[PDB]
Amino acid sequence: FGTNGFDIPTIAIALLIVGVIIGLSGLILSIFATATASAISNPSPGTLAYNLTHPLINGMVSFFSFFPTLYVLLGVTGIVLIAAGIISIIMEKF
Amino acid sequence: FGTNGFDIPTIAIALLIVGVIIGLSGLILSIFATATASAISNPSPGTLAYNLTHPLINGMVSFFSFFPTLYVLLGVTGIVLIAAGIISIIMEKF
C-alpha cells in the first residue's frame, strides 16, 4: 500500500517501535534514578564532601533538564516524515 | 478488477491490515503504559529524586501528546491514495 517506499503499515509499525522504546527508556531511567537518589547522601553544607560532590549533582540536574526538548524534537520529526510521504504521493500519483 | 495497479480487493486488504495493526499498537502501548504508571512512584515535591525524575515524565507526556496528530495524518493519507486511484482510472479508461 504505497508507491515507492511509503508504506502505511510500515509507518504504523515504526510508530509502535518508537513509542515502546521511549516508554522503556523512561521506565529504566526512572528506576535507575531512584537508586541514584537513594545512594548519595547529604554530608553537610560546607565541609569537604560537599565541595567534592555538589557540581556532579548539578550536572546531573542540568542534563536531565535538557532531556525534554530532545524528546519534543524527536516527536516533531515524525510529522515531517509523514508529510513528506504525503507530498511524494501527490507529486506523481496524478 | 483494475487497470494497472489499482485493485479494489487489494485496497480492502490493505485497509484491513492497517486497521488491525493500529488497534494492536494501541492495545500494546496502553498495557505497557499501565505498567509504567505502576512502577514509578512519587517521591516528594522538592527533594533529589524529584529533580532527577520529573523531566523524564514530562518528556513522556509530551511525546504521547504528539501521537494523535501523527495518527490523523496517517488516516488522511488513505483518502489521497484512493483518490489518486480514482483519477488514474478516469484518465485512460475513456
Add this chain to the structure above:
Amino acid sequence: FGTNGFDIPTIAIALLIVGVIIGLSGLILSIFATATASAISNPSPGTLAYNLTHPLINGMVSFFSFFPTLYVLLGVTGIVLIAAGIISIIMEKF
C-alpha cells in the same frame, strides 16, 4: 524509519545509552568522592602537612567545578544532532 542514516529508534536508543551512562558516572564519582573525603584529614592550619596537601585539594575542587559546563555542552550536542537530522530529511524528502 528514516532516509539514509537518521533512524528515530536508533536516536532513542542512543539517548537511553547516554542517559544511563551519565547517571552511572555521577553515582560512581559521588561514591568515590565520599571515600576521598573520609580518608584525608585536616592536620592544622600552618604546619608542614598543610603546605604539602592544600594545593592538591584545591586542584580537586577546581576540576570538579569544571565538570558542570562540560555536562551542559554534552547535552547541547544532542539538539544539534537531532536538528541536523531534521534538516537533512527536509532537504531531499521533497
Add this chain to the structure above:
Amino acid sequence: FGTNGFDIPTIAIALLIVGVIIGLSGLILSIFATATASAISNPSPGTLAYNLTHPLINGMVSFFSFFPTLYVLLGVTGIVLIAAGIISIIMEKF
C-alpha cells in the same frame, strides 16, 4: 484540455500541492516555535545573559514579521499565471 501547456487539471493539481505545502509549513513552524518559546527563559532585565540573548529574539521576531508579505506575494503569483494562460488561449484560439 488546453492548447500548448495550459491544462486546467494540471492547474488544479498544482493548486492542491501548493495549498497543502503551505498548510504543512505553517503547522511545522508553529509546532517548532512553541518549543522555542518553551526552551528560552527570561534571565533578568539588565544582567549579562540579557545583553547576550536579546538581539537574537529580536531578529527572530523581525524575520517572522517578514513572512506575511512573502506569503501574500506568493499568492498573487497564481493569479498572474492563470491570467497569462487565459490570454494565451484567446490569442491563437481564434
Add this chain to the structure above:
Amino acid sequence: FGTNGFDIPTIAIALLIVGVIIGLSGLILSIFATATASAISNPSPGTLAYNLTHPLINGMVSFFSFFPTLYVLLGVTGIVLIAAGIISIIMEKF
C-alpha cells in the same frame, strides 16, 4: 507550475527550510549563550582579571548587536526573489 525555474512549490519549500533553520539557530545560540553567561564571573571592578576580560565581553555584546540587521537583510532578500520571479513570468507569458 512555472515557466523556466520559478516553481511556487519550490518557493514554499525554500521558505519552510529557511524559517526552520533560523528558528534552530536562535534556539542553539540562546542555549549556548545561557551557558556562557553562567560560566564567566565578575571578579572585581579594577583588578587584573577585569582588565584581562572586559574587552572580550564587549566584543561579544557588539557582534550580537550586529546580528539583527543581518537577519533583517536576509528577510528582505526573499521579497526581491519572489518579485523577480513575478516580473520574469509577466515578461514572456504574454
Add this chain to the structure above:
Amino acid sequence: FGTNGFDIPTIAIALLIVGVIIGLSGLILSIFATATASAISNPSPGTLAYNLTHPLINGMVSFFSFFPTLYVLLGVTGIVLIAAGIISIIMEKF
C-alpha cells in the same frame, strides 16, 4: 533558493557557525584569562621582579584592548556580503 552562489539557507548556516565560534572563543579566552590572573602575583612596586614582569602584562592589556575593534569589523563584513548578494540578484534577475 538563489541564482549562482547566493543561497539563503547557506547564509543562515554560515551565520550560525560564526556566531557559535565567536561565543566559543569568548568562553575559552575568559576561562583562560581567569587562570592567568590567578597565577601571576604582585611582587612589589620597585624591586627586580616588577621591572621584569610589568611590560608583559602591559602588552597583554594592550592586545586585549585591540580585540573589540577586530570583532566589530568582523561583524561589519557580513552586511557587505549579504548586500553584495542582494545587488547581484537584482542585476540579472530582471
Add this chain to the structure above:
Amino acid sequence: FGTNGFDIPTIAIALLIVGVIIGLSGLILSIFATATASAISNPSPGTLAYNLTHPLINGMVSFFSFFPTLYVLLGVTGIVLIAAGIISIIMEKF
C-alpha cells in the same frame, strides 16, 4: 494448522508450559521464603548483629519488590507474539 511456523496447538501448549512453570516458581519461592523468615531472628535495634544483618534483608526486600514488574513484562510478551502471528497470517494468506 498454520502457514510457516505459527501453530495454534503449539501456542496453546506453550501457554500451558509457561503457566505451569510460573505457578511452580511461585510455590517454590514462597515455601523457601517461609523457611528464610523462620531462620533469621531479630537480635536488637542497635547492637552489632543488627548492623551486620539489616542491609541483607533490605536487599532481599528490594529484589522481591522488583519481581512483579518482571512478571508483568513476561506476560506482555505473549500478546506481542500472538499478534505478530496474526499479522503474518494476514500478510500472505491473501
